[PDB]
């Protein structure tokens, strides 16, 4: 109905938010949505929130495939019948007695969000097997605790076909039956690469990641960029590592589109489609190359391809051959992604260097290449001046990343870093003379 | 719509089915509509029409509990893997190997349904675990093979409840979590004794039990009269004793009514309501007991409680003292059950041996007791006569049981198994000539 | 739900009903279901038994045309209003002053159906006007009273199209616009004429028709039988008259198929399906007409056409040129019906007369025009025989019409009137010797 | 299902749209939702887009209360016939013969438009009459044309309150009954009077207002404001005015929160929500009251109750007492809307004028009189220098509606019209230097 509509629009902020949920819903989705992983404690304690929420994207049209565990009420149960829970090298040993104990509440809580999601008006369907077909991890460490070999699609699909959210136990079972214990969170992990979704999504109960160093959250990890100077850092705790590096992999073998989020459960319709929720988002994202010469470039040519996109050469002002001899004979810096999707040239030859070009994709903007390469220019120039069209798409970013503005006819002038009064006004006379 | 109308009324033959049905959705069913068993051999072949008129049920809103084997496909495959399969006892020795194919075949032709009645727009859950909890049979034996300790009905129930036919599949699994196969009819037999549904149905393929003896099918079959001597033929294979066998305990646990139908997919929702979906139908019934002698009864006197419930001497020609006189004094067979519900008496003496009382309960009609009274007369005397009133109730009935009728003023005479065209004008003239 | 079903069985008694229901569902209606003239007494009065049964119809498919009138309510707005109500030649001096409360009641009688069928899930479609054309009765006369030239059908057809019980007002407007006061009986009819439905009900406050002279009510009148010697009865009152004479003139260019009821609206969602429902339901239905000659029968060709149902003609052992040549050249009375629906041809030439054709429509077993046919049968033919399948639908009635019966494989003998014992068995003979 | 949400995003530009369409969705809208007149030309011609335009409202809630006429369609059958149409003072002159194939139109468009939202599964109820009561205009005149003299609101009602769009005709009639011609305009004005309605939309072919004079089109018109400076202007042609006084009219004696569109229909499913929309979109808003004094404000309370609006005066760094008192000694210029919902103050004092407070509320602001302010602002004060946070809502507009910024810790200057280099350099030093 409506209700539908409200609280859609309840969760839309900008209209970067609108064009994003526009491309998830006018996207023809052979490839699916999302593998959403639900840990056990939220089923037993924060289940209206949770089916609320997966309501509204089934209602919205979106499958989310959720894939759930059962943590805590397990512990409780064992404790109770008298067994004292055992955990070698972070997993659970799992023997017979145990195993019953386990299946019988995840079937409780795997029916439980069932009934659930179905009395919202949504069809639910149990998949307590047959997903996963698995072998023992080692029989004498964990005993019946299995290593998923492989997924079989079929029920997921023929699910989601016929109109009804699938929920997933993780449970696999071998070839021959016996049923076996699986971490909720590489089962999730084993599912998406199988369907390759467009968002994998972790529900924790804590909410992202904290820097306990800083205290700051983390909104955003670029795995290419920062991976490897975030992982060896003192400050990130083990189980975090454990995880990162788990996610990494993940990735590793999923496309570029593909991304993943850690959230708590309450901000979840948002940083499915935004990347302001709070809760921390990671993914791949593009190696930006730092270049300082033409003939470095491995793309003699598809720089030229790259710059041709710029609607001052596009529209004949100087050709890209004028251009080209110019950069060659002149100290800069470029930076640019592995595929050309975002080139940035930066003229260092003024006080104040100047950002020549910064020919950025329909894409590239999308998936704030951008903002990651002004994030690199402001370390690498501390101070900083470029010109944007006074009607260019995202002039508002312009401003955002600037100190100062100023507007002549047709052109905006923007600059950062830099405040002797005396500096400025050379810098706007400059641009105000530029007027040829 | 209408669509489901029609389909109803183009199954209504006579008054009496009308009544039928309504019982049945007049029935304020938390006690559950039917277990239907079906074979796998219906499902891989004879598929849609399975869905379609499942699909019926569900649209008239009857929940039918389905739970379906897998036979024949396995055992192609089996042999396609080259493993001649094997039977102990009626059931199937089952290792890893084997049970690994059963399993996959089991998951393949239980979304095959489902897929199917969904296509229909019927709503299916498959419920291809956790239903049944089992142990070895003999795990020397039958390696792999399950008997059902208990069914949990949890998921069956928030299934229906939730508006969405359950198809089980009719694997069970132990506490520790090894799956382990089970006939489909010995847990279609669990299913209905912790339900207690309505009707059970089970579906064959050739309809019904066929006589290897005679040719032609085993129409009532009453257990408690004719269990053991028509169980121990010569002609009745083994697998049918698995089935015969598990019926026969399955109605020892449940009422002397509920009964089992075994009936071809084709004609499926005729039985559902009336009993005219001929094919076989078994029950507890009555142990008839054959009596020679008024002082053999062991009611000396609710023999006479009995006889004084008929409508010729309630009405007072002849009194049941005078009558028993009678009987004494000639040579005469009677059937009765043991609480006399339904009497049969037959005087011998007049070849064309006369039935001369067959005082039957309206309880008696109801429960098919009379069908199986006559079914007894019909071995018992090939050839046989009698006198109803032209407006006895069920007289169609008689007339359904003879071969041929003649109706002098108030009362017709019917007869079977005689055709000497002059032994039957001899009854032809001893009834006319009967007017005293 | 089954909650239609449950409401439809229980108003189901006997077979003949089943029959009649399914005829209305099973037609595919471009031919229309009904036009049910309501008073307007009952939607100010008995308005919720009104609505309960309109929406039973709705449910089970069936949309009927209701067209009401405005009557008490009126008259005592008027006599509220100070106007003292006027009748010249029984029809109302309608004014302006008159007609403004005339149509202001007639508009707010007409929301009041629609406003409860629509709180019962129905769809109503309020239809005020544009139906009905007219001109004006007698304007010095009756004023602003109207006679209705023609109906337009648009509004109620892309009603009904779009699923919507059409609800008409009885108001009529001229060409350029001047609504009209008209009989909501002669308006009712008009639309009969015009839809050519299936039932005609005229729902009335009184319950029928009484015979003055007897007492006794009036079931049915079969038109084409009754008519003229039930009109010209001194008993029938002259308002009887003019409406009997009403109905028949109706029904005379309406279909067959097609009837009239007259009934209190209590009785009301029986006798639109049932002849059993107190009310007095009226149709042409059919005289037999006896006939000893092929060339006699109006139908040179039409008797061929008939004879064709025959499923031993149909199923080709005879074909019927190869029969009518047999017939031609034998002496044989024969029974039919004006339409032909229900044949008889008796062979006279052996003692024991055969039936030889008995070609029954499934319309002619329905409306037991072939009860009737037998009965003429049975005074024409003191003694008879016929064959019958086995499984001939309705062979349970063949017994009843017999006094003896014999059963050979497949087929079985009847007759009546005969009790020579040894002529019984000479037709017993010729019978089983008839396997030729 | 998305189907709705994709043409909601599909017509959302920017953030402040989003917050528009909220406001009429959490709307608890006892206060109707729209009438929309339609011209006869659009179902004859463009009615796909119109349908489905109108099934959007009804989707996502609202319901339309639409109102048809019937125009060249008609013009045309009269000219087929033979009858050169008649005009009178822009009244078509209808006599009997007229009326009827008037009639006939108004039944057939209407109903056309209500089988083809009927087909997008849109419940729509035809109201063809009773609705609109009236009287003749000047029967010698224009024969039956009516003067509407009331309108009935109940069928309009029950409709809506039964789900379904009520789909008027402009027929009126009398209260004796007779049906008059009714300007579509005028009939739509009415129903406007009658239900107050959020918007009014006049559905031309045409498609808004174009400037003959500039050729610019006219997007808003703010009566109060422009209303009469607007009208004696001798561009705007006598067809504008005697529509544009219509309007005034109308708005005059409507709430201040209902508006007029006059729109294409293809534009329509924006600008029924947008004022970006192209189209012409009228009403009264808000005459800004140019003051130079506190003791000019007619509020001299309500001018503070404004200003503690502001996050400055409310996070207490100077109250507004000791701000009123600065104000009051000091030449400023104040611009604000009657009821004080934004309020902007320009301190004269400095060259380069400040812009020392401008407070705006929430509703302001999706209002645009913030908008109209800045403009009032720009030509009186060509040249105009302002503070704003660095992270005030709409700091993008602020960018906008600047030619020059800084951005010292927190809080970003603007300004604009000004151009010496030097002049610049003073106001950025004495903003860096007013850090105390």
Same mark, same amino acid.
């Given at each position: 109905?409506?209700?539908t509509?409200?609280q859609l *629009?309840?969760n839309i902020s900008?209209?970067?938010?609108?064009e994003?949920?526009?491309?998830?819903?006018?996207?023809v989705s052979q490839?699916?949505?999302?593998?959403i992983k639900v840990?056990?404690a939220?089923?037993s304690?924060?289940?209206?929130?949770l089916a609320?929420?997966?309501?509204?994207?089934?209602?919205?049209?979106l499958?989310?495939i959720?894939?759930?565990?059962?943590?805590?009420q397990?512990?409780g149960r064992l404790?109770?019948?008298?067994?004292?829970?055992?955990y070698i090298?972070?997993?659970?040993?799992? &023997?017979?007695?145990?195993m019953?104990?386990?299946?019988?509440?995840?079937?409780?809580?795997?029916l439980?969000?069932?009934?659930?999601?179905?009395?919202?008006?949504?069809?639910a369907?149990p998949?307590?097997?047959?997903?996963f077909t698995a072998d023992?991890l080692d029989?004498?460490k964990?005993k019946?605790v299995?290593?998923?070999?492989?997924?079989?699609?079929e029920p997921?699909?023929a699910?989601?076909?016929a109109?009804?959210?699938?929920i997933?136990?993780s449970l696999? #079972?071998?070839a021959?039956?016996?049923?076996?214990?699986?971490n909720?969170?590489?089962?999730?992990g084993?599912l998406?690469?199988?369907?390759?979704?467009?968002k994998?999504?972790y529900?924790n109960?804590k909410?992202?990641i904290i820097n306990?160093?800083?205290?700051?959250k983390?909104?955003?990890?670029?795995?290419?960029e920062?991976?490897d100077?975030?992982?060896?850092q003192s400050?990130?705790?083990?189980?975090?590592? *454990?995880?990162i590096?788990?996610?990494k992999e993940?990735?590793?073998?999923?496309?570029?589109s593909?991304?993943?989020a850690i959230?708590?459960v309450?901000?979840?319709?948002?940083?499915?489609?935004?990347?302001?929720?709070?809760?921390?988002m990671?993914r791949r994202?593009?190696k930006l190359?730092?270049r300082?010469?033409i003939?470095e470039?491995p793309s003699?040519?598809?720089?030229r391809?790259a710059?041709?996109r710029?609607a001052?050469?596009?529209?004949?002002?100087?050709?890209?051959?004028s251009?080209?001899?110019?950069?060659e004979?002149?100290?800069?810096?470029?930076?640019?992604?592995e595929?050309? #999707?975002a080139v940035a040239?930066?003229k260092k030859?003024?006080?104040?260097?100047? *950002?020549d070009? $910064?020919?950025?994709?329909?894409?590239?903007?999308?998936?704030?290449?951008? &903002?990651?390469? $002004?994030?690199?220019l402001?370390?690498?120039?501390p101070?900083?001046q470029?010109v944007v069209?006074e009607?260019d798409?995202?002039?508002?970013?312009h401003?955002?990343k600037?100190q100062?503005?100023?507007?002549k006819?047709?052109?905006?002038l923007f600059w950062y870093?830099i405040?002797?009064?005396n500096?400025?006004?050379?810098?706007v006379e400059? $641009?105000?003379?530029?007027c &040829?």
């Open positions: 109905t409506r209700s509509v409200i *629009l309840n900008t209209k970067r938010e609108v994003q949920y526009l491309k998830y819903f006018t996207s490839q699916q949505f999302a593998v840990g056990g939220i089923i304690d924060n289940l209206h929130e609320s929420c997966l309501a509204f994207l089934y209602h919205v049209g499958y989310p959720v894939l759930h565990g059962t943590g805590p397990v512990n404790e109770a019948q008298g067994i004292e829970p055992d090298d972070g997993i659970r040993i799992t &023997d017979e007695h145990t019953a104990v386990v299946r019988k509440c995840f079937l409780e809580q795997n439980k969000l069932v009934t659930a999601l179905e009395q919202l008006g949504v069809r369907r998949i307590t097997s047959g997903v023992y029989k004498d964990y019946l299995g290593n998923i070999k492989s997924v079989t699609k997921i699909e699910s989601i076909k109109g009804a959210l699938p997933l136990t696999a #079972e071998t021959s039956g016996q049923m076996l214990n699986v909720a969170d590489v089962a999730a084993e998406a690469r199988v369907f390759e979704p467009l994998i999504v529900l109960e909410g992202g306990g160093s800083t205290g700051e983390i909104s955003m990890i670029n795995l290419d920062e991976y100077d975030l992982m060896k400050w990130v705790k083990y189980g975090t590592k *454990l995880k590096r788990e996610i993940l990735l590793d073998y999923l496309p570029r593909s991304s993943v959230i708590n309450q901000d979840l319709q948002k940083e499915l489609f935004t990347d302001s929720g709070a809760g921390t990671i994202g593009y190359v730092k300082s010469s003939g470039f003699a040519d598809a720089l391809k710059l041709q710029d001052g050469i596009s529209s004949g002002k100087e050709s890209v051959a251009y080209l001899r110019y950069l004979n002149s100290d800069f810096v470029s930076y640019a992604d595929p050309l #999707e040239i930066v030859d003024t006080n104040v260097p100047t *950002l070009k $910064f020919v950025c994709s329909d894409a590239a903007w999308l998936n704030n290449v951008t &903002d990651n390469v $002004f994030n690199v402001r370390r690498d120039f101070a900083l470029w069209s009607n798409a995202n002039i508002a970013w401003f955002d600037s100062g503005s100023y507007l006819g047709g052109k905006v870093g405040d002797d009064i500096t400025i006004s050379e810098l400059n $641009f105000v003379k530029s &040829d």
